[PDB]
Design a protein around this ligand. Structure first.
Ligand code: ANP
Ligand code: MG
Lengths: 613, 171, 561, 258, 198
């Protein structure tokens, strides 16, 4: 028993020596105390396991090899530190007896104890381990009783008692029957005070080895993990995750009398102490990034620099690159006070001859957008592309999964008519609605669509109408903001330029390799992703009178002047002008749309629509 | 450190990160463009037999050496927690040669104390696997894939010594 | 317009409310950063707080001001004129090893420079003079001389009596010359002199002196004197005769030591150069003359030893006193203190001195590079001056040190100027003053026997003085109780070299004049000691020892710098 | 088997604080500043003033420890390797000797406060540090046969104390601890405060004291030796009177207790 | 003791402008009609000359050495109000008055205390913390004709002190050089523990 006190003292010395943990305690406390007077941060701290090694090796190896005897006193000492620091007076009834101490978490240098579900072995029981894999199942969240409070009617005295179960504590104790006491030691009838009692959250999950590591087509192996309090619901199935915790056993293992002749083994678990994700998308900016982004935005022609830095390995097609950049920035989504909604996201279609880089260019967006789903037009059904029924439960399709993202559709011309018509809602109302046996529900699908197709005659025929070359209904083409036609026109200097370009491309060697070993200015893509993220989060350009003066004139002329234009012109064309102008102003990091943005947007729409600039 | 030693000849060719302190005409071939100058505060990766001189000759010398990734803080913590489990072969094929060269160059005290412990702790298991003679392959083969090129020679000359003695005795 | 639109073209149009404009304008004016810089830092501030609603309110701007000050302070935390004995002694050729590049250890021709004092005794704390301790030193001086006089003249202790008590019999009295009036007004005549007795001799009382019966005298304030006379009336002590104070003995060496010193120089003459500061003019800090001199030292003169007296950086220099120090364009980084000024100006020049020349540095009480600002004065800190240990030696002030057999006595206080004599008689007045002053120094057995020390005043404001720490004046006495062979006391007066009572007394003069014109330095040639040439005097005793007689075998040339 | 094979002041204070506490046994040497003299004395004086204030308010050891421990890091650090902290602690104690040797009331107040601070700091130690500190002070355990012969009486004496002071409510735990516990025999007059509370067993003029008790002997020896040293300090105060620059500081320090 | 009380008898530090020769009292980082402390250092308000660090530190060192030389001039004064004789002569008894019939006690007119306090006053002027807290001896009183009309804010003083930290530390280092040699400072425990030498 006496050893527990000395371990508390020794961890107190550690906490006094390495002062960056005191600042963490105090900052969480003052933050919580501020907003309480008007979200709340958890009572949890993460310690570097390296600091503890350099402070005291005997305590470090104790935490790492005998956690049941070292983690509890260390955690107790942390609570005393946080409790001795100043705190708000006159606590309420529930605060006075919360039964809520602070809790620890760990990072850095696990050494031999960094494992995977295949290799976790009986030698590692009762050690502190780190495992990696994929989440496959998650239980429902449930509350769990740990303490109850009672008021004695006659004497006016408040009583209480505590409960334990094998997964609630690192050390082992006699189990408790989960009964509520009805009567006092002195015969007084008792009452139960809910709201003063304490309950905590509980959730079980399962983690499996990654399929990339599975040997010989053999069955994969997995472990169950226990989570509670703050750790609940921070994961979902399909997540790649790294878990830290104590590996432990449970139950009687059939030695309490059973028919098995004790051939069956004991049960085992990992008690979740800390959870970290794995990147397999998001980035977080440093101060230097904000400075560089703001400085670069004042160049005369940022749009050209950024657009030409998209897919530099593809020669030509300047305007399609500019259109893709404006798509990645997007417009501004409006919700009016009466609940009415106005669309913000831009859709693009491109149709053309064989081999003209359509699929290759479409592939680039999938590797620079923060959320992107890819599909081929014939490998997907209307229900699979939007939503389907199962058991009643309703299951999402690809357009519902990419909600605030982009969806790429290749071989669009092969999609059947029965499949295409499921998409007409999603590209304007940005919702999916189902009315089938036992179900009625609406779902959100706010994404931007980009797609590629082949013309009807196998190559584009200029001697026939665009409707004859493009077999799609007018109501569908109207929903694409920009429609691009592209062809392989044979010419000497064009052929020479392209061929020399691809040959220069095929002579690349990566930096760390000798020759023959197997494996203007352009901003790098890892910087362009930060630029796009920053611009989409921090600036929301408002429209201006000077921009409107250009938009109205262009729309009425473009609609009323008779020309051989390749797409129907409708009330949706006006919105395309507003969206494109807003997106260009956003590239420029401007707080307002100006005459320049409207002019550029008009000059892009005119090129795509009327084929010439 | 002999002149004709192949391993020393081969270890001096590893590249280290570097930064320039003067602009110089025509030396752009270091940046793989012979037609251009080098400019101040440019950063390049150069082999050690060249960087070891350009960091010394003047005053301010032409190049400054940046702290390389194979001596990063993560590696030091990995070394100090469990030296026997560590995969030095993946970190760098010639680790204990480059370590001594870098120590001589900057006269480091603490790095020497870390590296001495690492060598002394790994020699123990190396002797264990050297002593163990058949009258097994998997258990030995898992550790002997984490040895440096430096450590393999010591293992080979130890194993042969024990085996020759055993052969002579039981004969 | 301008600030408002500049804000509204970086911050949103929501900033149009004039309080917000005023707050942001205040920030840019306070911290000198532009509006767009403020917008960038506002964006830095909007990060890291989970506050997507970082709205441009007054409270958010207050927190941004606090953030800005935190960033500011964190960035700060991140960031031949005259000659003595020319007809008898040729100028030495100097050290032959000077100019030889050879790294080889200087094997044979090693002039040995050795201090002849306890350096630790000079490392006392200054600016704390106890009056009782000062008075004890002054009393002990009188008592020490009483013992010397008693032994020399073979007088009985009962022959000494209190001169302040009326006596009809002639008595012997030892005391200190003091003014008759404690508030005396800077001019002392023979009739205004009194004798202060010791505590034991006369209970520290003062008696007026009647010098009517003395025909020839030369007295100064603070002088210890011995008189035979009587106090017949109780008012004045009538002096019948002045007892001359005995001179100290001369240094001696054994035959073996002299032969060793002769072998060390291979029979060649010793060459010593002596310079005294200041080393730049009163209107600039140019050391061109010193550089030229050092080049000559290294290539033509080639001395064995160089003695340099301060001040190196005179604190009383007019440009320092007026604060009109110039910029030094030759330096990449300007000096920030006078110590750094020495390190940038003097240290590069002094390091060019040949390592075969032993360099002795003696400070001045006016030297800014010395924190010990009192006489007696501790040595300069050689390491702080970044000077090499091999050939630079920093000595105290005064300093007694030995070069081979020759004992040098050095004091960097202007005793010759400061000592004002009260003289009577034709014979005394006809004698050269600096001889008489030199004799006073030798008889008193102290380099600066004047008390109270001299002071310099301007229209009155105190400027400077001898700056005597009276409690430590025992360190200014001749070490070992013998005179030096060569005594060097720099003075503002005209340079000279003379033989006074077998001691070569040298004032090298100032190295550079106030106007920038060349001053003077002293070149000392001393022939090697030879037991066979008869220039040494054998003193008979248990162990035969020899008087050095440096004055017979030394040439001193005073040379334009 | 294989086999291989002023600075003095700093070493002195390293030796004096290896035990983490000291009886303040030895003459300091070298120099510090007069500002340091005043400030260090005032810092220790503030801690002792609060100790005496809490004792006059009749607060318990736990309450005083809660009040005083945050003040060490600001005024008078403890459990520290710093030479400056060690010199500050040592010198401040020695200064307040010269302030509080002057009268019986001042000596009693200073001895009381300093002994209570000694108790507080001893409670802060680990048992190993306590053992090493006691052993360093050159401070008779009974034989196993004598313990066996007196086992009934000793167990009857300590059984309640084991339950209340060491929380050993189980009799089985008390028996195991008693089997492992050592006992000290000394004259009853040396532990009379424990005698009056009947916390020790008495036989033939000797008191039998368990090893988990007896800290009052250590603190009483500290108090007694400090009182004797203060009496000595008082006898050579005329030598302190040779530096006038110290007397106003000492008068100021003593005025807060008068 | 406050700096105001401690330094009541100290001589104010006067600096002479290297360009226009105007002399003015220096009181640290405070408002003054004669000088301004900017981010670049000390500036004369008369001619806008910026002081180099050497120009400032040399004047401080000159003032320090002037006070030291004055101390060693050794003027003594009798404490008897009727005699009050001032002389540089020292009797062999030291404290005995040299005027016949006077029983007063001779004392240094400029004592080691006054010199030490003067040096500390100079040190305080360059203490960054004292400047930030505005704990320096004032060089102007509110009723003085030269009282500055515009006062520096506390925030401005803290900022200017941080910006001029290197200059202030350099000036302070010059003062500390002499303070470390001042005998009035330290206390030797070795000699003091003569009872243990009983
Ligand atoms: N500048 C370029 N212009 C055209 N094709 C290029 C260019 N650079 C490379 N290619 C190559 O063109 C080939 C065909 O590109 P791809 O994107 O599949 O054409 P596509 O429009 O999808 N043709 P298709 O699959 O028949 O509809 C690929 O192998 C590319 O590497
Ligand atoms: Mg293709």
């Amino acid at each position: 028993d006496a050893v527990f006190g000395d371990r508390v003292r020794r961890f107190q010395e550690f906490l006094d020596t390495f002062t960056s943990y005191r600042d963490s305690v105090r900052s969480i406390q003052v933050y919580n105390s501020n907003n309480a007077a008007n979200n709340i941060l958890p009572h949890r701290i993460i310690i570097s396991l390296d600091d503890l090694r350099e402070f005291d090796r005997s305590f470090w190896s104790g935490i790492l090899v005998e956690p049941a005897y070292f983690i509890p006193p260390a955690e107790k000492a942390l609570t005393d530190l946080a409790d001795s620091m100043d705190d708000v007076p006159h606590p309420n009834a529930s605060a006075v007896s919360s039964r809520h101490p602070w809790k620890l978490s760990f990072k850095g240098s696990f050494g031999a104890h960094a494992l995977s579900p295949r290799t976790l072995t009986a030698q590692h029981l009762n050690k502190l381990v780190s495992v990696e894999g994929i989440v496959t199942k998650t239980s429902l969240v449930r509350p769990k009783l740990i303490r109850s409070v009672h008021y004695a009617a006659k004497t006016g005295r408040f009583h209480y008692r505590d409960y334990t179960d094998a997964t609630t504590t690192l050390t082992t104790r006699i189990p408790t029957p989960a009964i509520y006491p009805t009567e006092d030691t002195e015969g007084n009838k008792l009452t139960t005070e809910y709201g003063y009692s304490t309950f905590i959250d509980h959730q079980r999950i399962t983690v499996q080895e990654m399929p990339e590591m599975a040997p010989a087509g053999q069955l994969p192996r997995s472990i169950d993990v226990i989570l509670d309090d703050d750790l609940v619901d921070k994961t979902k199935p399909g997540d790649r995750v790294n878990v830290v915790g104590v590996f432990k056993s449970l139950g009687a293992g059939g030695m309490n009398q059973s028919n098995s002749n004790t051939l069956i083994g004991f049960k085992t678990l990992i008690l979740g102490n800390t959870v970290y994700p794995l990147h397999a998308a998001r980035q977080m900016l440093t101060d230097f990034d904000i400075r560089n982004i703001n400085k670069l935005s004042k160049k005369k022609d940022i749009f050209d620099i950024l657009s030409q830095s998209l897919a530099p390995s593809i020669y030509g097609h300047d305007h399609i690159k500019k259109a893709i950049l404006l798509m990645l920035m997007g417009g501004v989504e409006k919700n009016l006070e009466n609940g009415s909604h106005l669309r913000g996201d831009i859709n693009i279609l491109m149709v053309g001859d064989p081999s003209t880089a359509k699929s290759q260019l479409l592939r680039f967006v999938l590797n620079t957008a923060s959320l992107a789903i890819a599909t081929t037009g014939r490998g997907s059904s209307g229900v699979g592309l939007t939503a389907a029924v199962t058991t009643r439960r309703l299951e999402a399709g690809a357009m519902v999964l990419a909600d605030r993202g982009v969806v790429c559709i290749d071989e669009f011309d092969k999609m059947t008519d029965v499949d295409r018509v499921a998409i007409h809602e999603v590209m304007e109302q940005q919702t999916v609605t189902i009315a089938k046996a036992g179900i009625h529900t609406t779902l959100n699908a706010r994404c931007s669509v980009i797609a590629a197709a082949n013309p009807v005659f196998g190559q584009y025929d200029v001697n026939r109408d665009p409707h004859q070359n493009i077999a799609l209904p007018d109501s569908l083409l109207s929903r694409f903001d920009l429609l691009f036609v592209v062809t392989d026109d044979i010419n000497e200097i064009r052929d020479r330029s392209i061929s020399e370009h691809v040959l220069r491309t095929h002579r690349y060697l990566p930096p760390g390799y000798l020759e023959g070993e197997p494996v203007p200015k352009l901003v790098t893509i890892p910087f362009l992703r930060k630029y796009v993220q920053y611009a989409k989060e921090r600036v929301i350009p408002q429209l201006t009178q000077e921009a409107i003066n250009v938009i109205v004139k262009n729309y009425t002329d473009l609609r009323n002047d008779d020309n051989t234009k390749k797409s129907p012109i409708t009330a949706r064309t006006l919105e395309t002008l507003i969206r494109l102008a807003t997106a260009h102003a956003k590239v420029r990091l401007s707080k307002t749309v100006n005459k320049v943005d409207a002019k550029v947007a008009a000059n892009l729409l005119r090129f795509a629509l009327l084929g010439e600039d | 450190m002999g002149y004709y030693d192949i391993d020393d000849v081969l270890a001096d060719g590893t590249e280290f990160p570097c930064k320039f302190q003067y602009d110089i005409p025509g030396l752009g071939y270091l940046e793989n463009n012979p037609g251009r100058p080098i400019t101040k505060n440019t950063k390049l990766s150069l082999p050690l037999w060249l960087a070891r001189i350009l960091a010394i000759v003047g005053p301010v010398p032409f190049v400054e050496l940046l702290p390389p990734d194979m001596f990063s803080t993560k590696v030091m913590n990995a070394i100090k927690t469990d030296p026997v489990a560590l995969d030095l072969h993946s970190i760098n094929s010639h680790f204990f040669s480059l370590a001594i060269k870098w120590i001589m160059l900057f006269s480091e005290k603490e790095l020497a104390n870390v590296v001495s412990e690492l060598l002394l702790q790994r020699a123990q298991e190396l002797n264990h696997h050297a002593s163990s003679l058949s009258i097994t392959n998997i258990a030995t083969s898992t550790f002997l894939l984490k040895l440096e090129e430096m450590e393999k020679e010591i293992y080979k000359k130890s194993h042969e010594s024990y085996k020759d003695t055993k052969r002579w005795m039981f004969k | 317009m301008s600030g408002s639109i500049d804000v509204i073209t970086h911050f949103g149009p929501d900033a149009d409310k004039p309080e917000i404009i005023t707050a942001l304008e205040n920030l840019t004016k306070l911290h000198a950063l532009s509006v767009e810089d403020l917008y960038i830092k506002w964006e830095q501030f909007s990060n890291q707080r989970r506050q997507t609603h970082t709205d441009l309110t007054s409270k958010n701007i207050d927190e941004f001001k606090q953030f800005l000050q935190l960033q500011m302070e964190k960035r700060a935390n991140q960031i031949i004129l005259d000659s003595l004995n020319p007809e008898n002694i040729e100028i030495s050729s100097g050290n032959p090893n000077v100019g030889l590049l050879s790294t080889e250890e200087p094997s044979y021709n090693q002039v040995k420079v050795e201090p002849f004092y306890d350096a630790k005794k000079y490392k006392f704390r200054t600016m704390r003079q106890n009056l009782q301790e000062a008075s004890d030193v002054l009393d002990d001086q009188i008592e020490s001389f009483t013992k010397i006089i008693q032994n020399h003249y073979k007088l009985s202790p009962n022959d000494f009596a209190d001169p302040t008590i009326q006596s009809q019999s002639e008595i012997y009295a030892v005391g200190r010359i003091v003014p008759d009036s404690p508030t005396y007004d800077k001019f002392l005549n023979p009739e205004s002199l009194s004798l202060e007795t010791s505590r034991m001799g006369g209970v520290g009382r003062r008696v007026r002196l009647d010098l009517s019966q003395v025909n020839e005298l030369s007295f100064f304030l603070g002088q210890i004197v011995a008189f035979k006379g009587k106090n017949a009336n109780g008012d004045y002590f009538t002096v019948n005769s002045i007892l001359p104070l005995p001179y100290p003995n001369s240094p001696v060496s054994t035959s073996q030591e002299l032969q060793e010193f002769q072998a060390n120089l291979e029979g060649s003459s010793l060459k010593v150069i002596v310079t005294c500061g200041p080393y730049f003019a009163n209107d600039n800090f140019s050391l061109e003359l010193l550089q030229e001199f050092i080049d000559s030292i290294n290539n033509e003169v080639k001395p064995h030893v160089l003695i340099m007296f301060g001040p190196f950086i005179d604190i009383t220099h007019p440009l320092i006193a007026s604060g009109k120090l110039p910029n030094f364009p030759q330096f990449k980084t300007q000096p920030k203190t006078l110590d750094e000024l020495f390190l940038k100006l003097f240290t590069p020049i002094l390091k060019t001195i040949s390592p075969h020349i032993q360099t002795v540095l003696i400070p001045s009480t006016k030297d800014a590079i010395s924190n010990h600002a009192a006489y007696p004065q501790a040595s300069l800190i050689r390491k702080a001056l970044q000077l090499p240990k091999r050939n630079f030696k920093c000595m105290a002030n005064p300093s007694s040190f030995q070069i081979n057999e020759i004992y040098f006595g050095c004091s960097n206080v202007d005793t010759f100027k400061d000592l004002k004599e009260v003289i009577k008689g034709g014979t005394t007045s006809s004698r050269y003053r600096l001889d008489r002053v030199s004799e006073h120094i030798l008889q008193q057995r102290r380099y600066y026997p004047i008390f109270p020390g001299s002071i310099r005043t301007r229209i009155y404001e105190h400027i400077s003085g001898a700056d005597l720490d009276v409690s430590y004046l025992g360190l200014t006495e001749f070490v070992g109780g013998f005179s030096p062979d060569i005594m060097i006391i720099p003075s503002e007066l005209q340079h000279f070299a003379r033989v006074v009572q077998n001691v070569v007394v040298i004032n090298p003069g100032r190295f550079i004049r106030a106007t920038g014109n060349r001053g003077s330095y002293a070149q000392i040639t001393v022939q090697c000691p030879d037991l066979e040439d008869g220039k040494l005097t054998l003193v008979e005793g248990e162990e035969p020892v020899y008087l050095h007689n440096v004055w017979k075998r030394a040439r001193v040339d005073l040379i334009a710098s | 088997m294989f086999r291989q094979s002023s600075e003095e002041e700093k070493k002195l204070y390293a030796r004096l604080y290896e035990s983490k506490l000291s009886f303040y046994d030895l003459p300091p040497q070298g120099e510090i500043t007069l500002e340091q003299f005043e400030i260090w004395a005032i810092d220790r004086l503030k801690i002792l003033l609060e100790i005496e204030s809490c004792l006059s308010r009749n607060k318990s050891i736990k309450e005083i420890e809660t009040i005083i421990k945050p003040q060490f890091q600001k005024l008078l650090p403890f459990n520290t390797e710093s030479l400056e902290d060690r010199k500050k602690d040592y010198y401040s104690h020695f200064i307040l000797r010269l302030c509080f040797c002057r009268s019986k009331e001042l000596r009693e107040k200073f001895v009381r406060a300093e002994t209570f601070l000694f108790k507080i700091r001893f409670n802060m130690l680990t048992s190993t540090d306590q053992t090493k500190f006691v052993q360093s002070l050159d401070l008779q355990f009974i034989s196993n046969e004598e313990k066996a012969e007196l086992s009934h009486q000793l167990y009857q004496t300590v059984s309640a104390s084991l339950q209340f002071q060491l929380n050993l409510n189980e009799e089985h735990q008390r028996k195991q601890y008693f089997q492992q516990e050592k006992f000290i025999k000394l004259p009853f007059e040396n532990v009379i405060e424990l005698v009056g509370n009947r916390l020790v067993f008495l036989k033939d003029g000797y008191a039998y004291l368990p090893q988990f008790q007896q800290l009052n002997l250590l603190s009483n020896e500290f108090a007694s030796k400090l009182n004797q040293e203060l009496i000595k300090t008082y006898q050579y105060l005329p030598r302190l009177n040779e530096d006038d620059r110290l007397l106003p500081i000492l008068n100021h320090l003593s005025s807060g207790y008068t | 003791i406050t700096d105001v009380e401690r330094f009541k008898d100290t001589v104010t530090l006067e600096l002479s402008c290297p360009s226009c020769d105007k002399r003015f009292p220096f009181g640290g980082i405070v408002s003054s009609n004669y000088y301004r402390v900017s981010y670049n250092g000390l500036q004369c308000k008369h001619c806008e000359q910026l002081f180099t660090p050497l120009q400032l530190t040399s004047q401080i060192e000159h003032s320090i050495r002037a006070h030291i030389s004055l101390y060693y001039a050794g003027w003594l004064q009798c404490d008897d109000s009727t005699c009050g004789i001032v002389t540089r002569q020292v009797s062999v008894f030291g404290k005995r008055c040299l005027n016949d019939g006077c029983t007063g006690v001779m004392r240094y007119k400029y004592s080691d205390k006054q010199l030490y306090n003067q040096l500390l006053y100079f040190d305080s002027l360059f203490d960054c913390e004292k400047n930030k807290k505005q704990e320096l001896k004032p060089i102007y009183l509110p009723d003085d004709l030269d009282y500055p009309k515009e006062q520096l804010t506390e925030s401005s003083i803290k900022a200017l002190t941080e910006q001029n930290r290197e200059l202030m530390e350099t000036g302070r280092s010059v003062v500390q050089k002499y303070l470390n040699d001042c005998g009035r400072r330290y206390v030797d425990m070795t000699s003091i523990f003569d009872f243990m030498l009983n």
